[PDB]
């Protein structure tokens, strides 16, 4: 839950065949919990032998299309699909719709390990980069190394140790390789004080992000209101309403040595920011925590400003 000993960037993590919808109320860029699970699985298959520890992620989202189409010029969109194989009766399958996108990202992390304490620097960085491209991240395989490998080997950029002015120039030595994207950070305090400031009509809580992906205007009794960025809802955690269970209590879990809880979605909003407009790059990580006293199994960006 701490700023790292050292950062670790992976400049063109070109991925492919991702999941677009990721939640029942949006379809764009996938959930940040997919990336936190990605780095937990990377920590599981790397840092138990190389002794590091990964907590937060950094999204930059270079380019993002989606297999979507416009039906007959309506004010809506549709999805492109994939052909399911043949049913046992052999007429057609029960066709089911899901969004599948092909995005671009670069992930910076947070390390509590010995990458330059008892192991050398680019050996650890190169083995982690070479081993990262063998696993999926959002239901989609990473597009492997190609002509994009030519800027892909990286440093292992320290933060916690160095000169202060060179702390500045190391984090903006990391910013120089990160220009054409737009980073994702949460707006938790903006959620709080923007629902509480605008409580002059009703106190409802789920109507906040349900009333921001639209052009709000109280026009002239032509002046479009001051948009503060890119107001867009995100899946911001998991409320587990029903209590805990057991592997023998509810059968058909994945492993029978880990407990089961039925869960529901939660919607905060996440602004999109250029990386220049931050406090520091250690101030944008999507961490993880679980509060089993509550139902809140919620990830977060602590200290986004």
């Amino acid at each position: 839950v701490t700023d790292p000993e050292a950062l670790l960037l992976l400049p063109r993590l070109s991925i492919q065949n991702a999941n677009a919808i990721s939640s029942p109320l949006t379809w764009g860029f996938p959930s940040p919990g997919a990336f936190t699970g990605f780095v937990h699985a990377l920590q599981r298959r790397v840092g138990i032998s190389l002794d590091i520890e990964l907590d937060g992620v950094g999204i930059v989202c270079h380019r993002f299309e989606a297999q979507i189409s416009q039906p007959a010029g309506k004010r809506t969109k549709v999805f492109n699909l994939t052909r399911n194989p043949l049913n046992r009766d052999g007429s057609t399958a029960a066709i089911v719709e899901e969004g599948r996108a092909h995005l671009e990202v670069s992930l910076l992390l947070g390390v509590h390990g010995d990458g330059l304490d008892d192991h050398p620097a680019q050996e650890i960085a190169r083995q982690v980069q070479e081993q990262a491209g063998a696993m999926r991240l959002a239901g989609g395989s990473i597009l492997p190394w190609c002509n994009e490998r030519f800027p892909a080997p990286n440093a292992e950029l320290l933060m916690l140790g160095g000169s202060d002015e060179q702390r500045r120039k190391n984090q903006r030595r990391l910013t120089r390789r990160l220009l054409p994207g737009f980073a994702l950070v949460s707006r938790e305090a903006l959620l709080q004080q923007h629902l509480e400031t605008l409580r002059t009509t009703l106190p409802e809580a789920t109507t906040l992000d349900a009333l921001l992906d639209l052009c709000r205007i109280n026009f002239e009794p032509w002046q479009v209101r001051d948009k503060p960025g890119w107001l867009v809802p995100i899946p911001a955690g998991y409320n587990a309403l029903s209590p805990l269970y057991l592997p023998g209590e509810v059968r058909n879990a994945r492993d029978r040595e880990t407990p089961l809880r039925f869960v529901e979605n939660l919607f905060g909003l996440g602004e999109w920011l250029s990386p220049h407009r931050v406090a520091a790059l250690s101030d944008l990580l999507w961490y993880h925590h679980a509060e089993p006293d509550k139902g809140l199994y919620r990830w977060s960006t602590p200290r986004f400003v």
């Binding site: 109320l25 949006t26 379809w27 764009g28 860029f29 699970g37 937990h40 989202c61 270079h62 380019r63 004010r75 809506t76 969109k77 549709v78 999805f79 029960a94 089911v96 719709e97 995005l103 220009l179 054409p180 994207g181 737009f182 809580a205 789920t206 349900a210 992906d213 639209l214 052009c215 026009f219 002239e220 009794p221 002046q223 867009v232 911001a236 409320n239 587990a240 029903s242 209590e249 509810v250 059968r251 058909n252 880990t258 089961l260 809880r261 039925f262 869960v263 529901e264 979605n265 939660l266 250029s274 220049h276 993880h288 925590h289 679980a290 509060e291 089993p292 509550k294 139902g295 919620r298």
Partner: protein
């Protein structure tokens, strides 16, 4: 007592919509069948035929054709942290419509208007004293109706699951794993559809289009909803989930979530004459939108100085960051970067847009093809600041008029720090 003095009348008002389902002989048998319910015995027949169902508010049977899942719409509160937004409560217009397997709609369509205006929906679980007085029969038929009502929201506590329930590990803080199977909240998505269909056509569309067409507005809540995609759950055979009729044939649509580079953007600084060879432009359409958003608030009034005290210079720094993003986008689509027809202004304008290292350069290649002199970029930023908004000779009487020049100097300092190592 609106189950005999309105329930005999309701079975009679279905005995006027029972003459439609009436032939002579087979319809006389159908009148005997449906008048063993719509005459005196609605509770016993309804509890016999529909006694073991499962209503819901967010189920998971419609995530696969022949799968299994959970049935729980409870947890009507979440008294914890006020930083999220979900299904902790609906508040007003409480709806509950889950599919289950309930096929007889006419047995659950002549029982819902006993609680619209009264408390006949308050006996759906227990405490049926008026529910046993509003039957006219003994404890047997009212007990059959109470069984069919207490099974309509049956909650055992421990549901079951199928292999395709999308079961997800969530990591504890340095500890084990509580695996989560999320579901699909149906009445919540239809609540979103209630607000969206209210504000997409009918009232607000006709109002906003005609109003902002010519004059016809008292300014109210009117808005536009772009970038919503259609998500279907059966297509042309929809029998998966509930709330599914012939306008809602999988008609669940989906609010936008696109990133900061969703659509495409055309280039404006190629290695040509009008692209880079005439380099005192700084042209961009997003820069034009940022300039229009600045010029729409180019006058600091006597009220909004608290909101206009960190929204102008910060917006100018965001415009400089957008120029840096344009430089980064130009910093990948230049395979051939060197001297050519249309590179006079791009010979100094190619500092931030650093092209590839020229082979024709000698050992002194750091002067024309390796120019690490981003000091005239400060001159270009000064030209852009002078050409952004016309600074008048008497618009600096307050502490934010020369402060515009202070913000321009801060933007020039940020540009000098950014281009301190541009060609190098």
């Amino acid at each position: 007592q609106e189950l005999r003095q309105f329930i005999e009348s309701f079975i009679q008002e279905r005995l006027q919509g029972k003459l439609d389902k009436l032939q002579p002989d087979e319809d006389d048998k159908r009148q005997t069948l449906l008048a063993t319910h719509r005459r005196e015995a609605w509770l016993a027949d309804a509890a016999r035929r529909v006694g073991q169902l499962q209503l819901v508010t967010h189920t998971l049977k419609p995530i696969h054709p022949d799968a299994r899942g959970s049935n729980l719409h409870s947890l009507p509160q979440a008294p914890g942290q006020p930083g999220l937004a979900g299904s902790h409560e609906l508040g007003d217009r409480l709806v509950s419509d889950v599919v289950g397997n309930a096929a007889a709609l006419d047995v659950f369509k002549f029982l819902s208007l006993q609680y619209q205006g009264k408390n006949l929906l308050n006996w759906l679980t227990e405490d049926s004293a008026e529910a046993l007085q509003a039957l006219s029969d003994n404890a047997e038929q009212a007990r059959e109706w109470r069984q069919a009502f207490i099974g309509i929201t049956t909650v055992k506590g421990a549901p079951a699951s199928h292999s395709l329930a999308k079961q997800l590990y969530f990591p504890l803080p340095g500890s084990g794993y509580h695996l989560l199977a999320p579901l699909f909240p149906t009445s919540l998505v239809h609540h979103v559809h209630a607000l969206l269909r209210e504000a997409r056509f009918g009232d607000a569309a006709k109002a906003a289009r005609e109003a902002r067409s010519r004059q016809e507005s008292w300014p109210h809540g009117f808005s536009e909803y772009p970038n919503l995609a259609i998500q279907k759950f059966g297509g042309t055979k929809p029998q998966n989930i509930s709330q599914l009729n012939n306008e809602r044939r999988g008609e669940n649509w989906l609010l936008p979530s696109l990133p900061p580079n969703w659509q495409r953007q055309n280039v404006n600084a190629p290695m040509r004459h009008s692209s880079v060879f005439e380099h005192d432009f700084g042209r961009t359409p997003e820069v034009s939108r940022l300039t229009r958003t600045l010029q729409r608030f180019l006058a600091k009034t006597v009220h909004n100085n608290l909101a206009i005290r960190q929204r102008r210079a910060q917006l100018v720094a965001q415009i400089c960051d957008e120029a840096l993003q344009y430089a980064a986008r130009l910093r990948e689509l230049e395979p051939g970067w060197s001297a050519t027809p249309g590179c006079q202004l791009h010979d100094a304008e190619q500092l931030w847009l650093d092209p590839l290292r020229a082979q024709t350069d000698e050992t002194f290649l750091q002067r024309r093809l390796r120019g690490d002199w981003p000091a005239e970029v400060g001159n270009r930023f000064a030209n852009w600041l002078n050409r952004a908004v016309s600074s008048d000779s008497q618009i600096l009487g307050s502490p934010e008029a020369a402060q515009w020049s202070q913000e321009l100097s801060k933007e020039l300092t940020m540009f000098k720090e950014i281009l301190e190592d541009e060609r190098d």
